[PDB]
Design a protein around this ligand. Structure first.
Ligand SMILES: *[C@@H]1O[C@H](CO)[C@@H](O)[C@H](O)[C@H]1NC(C)=O
Ligand SMILES: [Ca+2]
Ligand SMILES: [Ca+2]
Ligand SMILES: [Ca+2]
Ligand SMILES: [Ca+2]
Ligand SMILES: [Ca+2]
Ligand SMILES: [Ca+2]
Lengths: 265, 267
């Protein structure tokens, strides 16, 4: 079902009267139908109510043709493309073909849908015949949704008296679908003070507290947050030599993220 | 296997030294292979002699890449697509013994691409392309021959009974249909004798050495066949002693010759 030919009854002779033939064309998923004509010779009438070639889908009429390609409503060299993978064609003939119209000769074929051109791929889209797939930029990992591109952002440990911690690629949009664990572990006796600076931009919601992306900060047996939005939390003075910062990002958005510096009190 | 992805060993980490991997890609008949790269980071060398990605067929090297996409004036693939001539593509990544610098290799993607045979022993009239193949069809009034390629006609449904008349090759003086077999029959009453006379253009494919090996006219009168006739020069007028004559016109699968016209008169 990648291709086919269709003719009116009797072709290349004049078609009979009182005839009605329907052809249903189905192609696999990821394909559309292309239809064109090499010969078209029908009765010409007002809005093709008498004799006609009707091209339609299951819920939509794509085209209706009648008349003669010579001096007339005809398809001409025009291609009829279906929106999806289905096309129905009906040739109808009324009660009298006294002029001996010779009908039509048509050809159809499956055409690949280019999904990349038509929940899209986060980074790269790759089209192929019958489908498509997504891939990611260097340094990113395709998520389990087969669509978004996450990163590994947990392989860290901050042990020095002062330091800087940011969302991945800050201040460029942070990676979607990621789960970053930043760990501060200073020397016993040191107490960590946290301080946000620069751009702060974490996707939020006007009514619901941080339903999408957020920072949580665990110090001792207690979690601070979640934090999101355009306004950073106020500086945080812990009484702890160790702090965990968890940054969660969902499958959507282009927010720029956050930066913090830490210092021992 | 209409598509696939290929990476260097270790990707996205630096590739190991002394490694050699070949990927053979075969697609069905009527398809070609399209190959492109999303990341390319190799050692650079003269003719890519050290580290390289070599793209080839069974008898032809299509491309050889090396170097890093960052630095320019290089032998990297860039955004360029590599297209195989046929339905086979072989790819070899080679890394020599010297990997001082830590190059991260490559990320490649390939897919089958339909050959458009109509664009790229061809259809006489219409060619129709589809995914994985193609077919021919004919103009209105013609019939696709058993070769699935040339377009013949029915040209034998005739009978000339009038005292005078005109007979021509089909569509004269436009090119006559290939692969056809026309039978023209003149039948007059007993005692009439048919004279034949060619006129206007006469153009039947011929050969300089061999008598009419391609197309020809034969004319049967009584128990005798005249001809075969072909070429650019019509036979001289033919006076039969017969009230009935058969003209056979044969055309082969090739050529665009304009044909012939004759008038007849029953004496
Ligand atoms: C003509 O077409 C048929 C299919 O319709 C094909 O199988 C057959 O082999 C073709 N003839 C030649 C000589 O290829
Ligand atoms: Ca009618
Ligand atoms: Ca596709
Ligand atoms: Ca988000
Ligand atoms: Ca090397
Ligand atoms: Ca094709
Ligand atoms: Ca010829």
């Amino acid at each position: 079902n990648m291709f086919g030919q269709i003719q009116s009854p009797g072709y290349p002779d004049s078609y009979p009267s009182d005839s009605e033939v329907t052809w249903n064309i189905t192609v696999p998923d990821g394909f559309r139908i292309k239809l064109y004509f090499m010969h078209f010779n029908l009765e010409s009438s007002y809005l093709c109510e008498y004799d006609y070639v009707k091209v339609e889908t299951e819920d939509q009429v794509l085209a209706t043709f009648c008349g003669r390609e010579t001096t007339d409503q005809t398809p001409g060299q025009e291609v009829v493309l279906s929106p999806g993978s289905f096309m129905s064609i009906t040739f109808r003939s009324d009660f009298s073909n006294e002029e001996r119209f010779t009908g039509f000769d048509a050809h159809y074929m499956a055409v690949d849908v280019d999904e990349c051109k038509e929940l899209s791929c986060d980074h790269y889209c790759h089209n192929y015949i019958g489908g498509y797939y997504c891939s990611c930029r260097f340094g990113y990992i395709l998520h389990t949704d087969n669509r978004t591109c996450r990163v590994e952002c947990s392989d860290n440990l901050f042990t020095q008296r002062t330091g800087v911690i940011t969302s991945p690629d800050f201040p460029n949009p942070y990676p979607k679908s990621s789960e970053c664990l930043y760990t501060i572990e200073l020397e016993e006796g040191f107490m960590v003070n946290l301080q946000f600076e620069d751009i702060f931009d974490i996707e939020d919601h006007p009514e619901v507290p941080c339903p999408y992306d957020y920072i949580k900060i665990k110090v001792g047996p207690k979690v601070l947050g979640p934090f999101c939005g355009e306004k950073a939390p106020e500086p945080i003075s812990t009484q702890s030599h160790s702090v965990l910062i968890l940054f969660h990002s969902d499958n959507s958005g282009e927010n720029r993220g956050w930066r913090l510096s830490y210092r021992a009190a």
